[PDB]
Design a protein around this ligand. Structure first.
Ligand SMILES: Cc1cc(C(N)=O)ccc1-c1[nH]c(C)c2c1CCCCC2=O
Ligand SMILES: [Cl-]
Length: 120
């Protein structure tokens, strides 16, 4: 069915980000002490990780295909806000963001967004 199909595509796409070079840094939520960034949650008010998105997909918390995109984009927007441009972490965020946006086209995922937008 319609929602089962884009759930399945979203699961495939999120797994491909996890396996992308450097993707491990987005897999779990940042540990502010362990990653030596004690102010992280003072700057990032809406934290997000690949594992959060995987849990939402597993539990059925998404109603619309755009909700998945919004959460993944939030990962990269948090990355670019906290980290200085040209840092190893910022570079990695931009790499995976570009990969992600291409995958949305290549996989057809954007077609589910287009259809769901018409349904309102
Ligand atoms: C780099 C890094 C390495 C590991 C690991 N397990 O090796 C896990 C998390 C992070 C990480 N992820 C993000 C997204 C960040 C960080 C910490 C540094 C700056 C803050 C930030 O945005
Ligand atoms: Cl690392």
């Amino acid at each position: 069915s319609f929602n089962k199909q884009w759930y399945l595509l979203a699961n495939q796409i999120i797994q491909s980000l996890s396996k992308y070079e450097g993707g491990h840094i987005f897999e779990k939520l940042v540990d502010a002490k362990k990653q030596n960034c004690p102010d992280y949650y003072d700057v990032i008010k809406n934290p997000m990780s690949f594992s959060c998105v995987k849990t939402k997909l597993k539990k059925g918390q998404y109603g619309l295909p755009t909700e998945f995109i919004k959460d993944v984009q939030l990962i990269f927007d948090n990355c670019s806000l906290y980290n200085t441009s040209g840092s190893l972490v910022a570079i990695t965020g931009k790499n995976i963001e570009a990969y992600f946006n291409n995958q949305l086209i290549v996989t057809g995922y954007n077609n589910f967004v287009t259809k769901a937008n018409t349904i309102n």
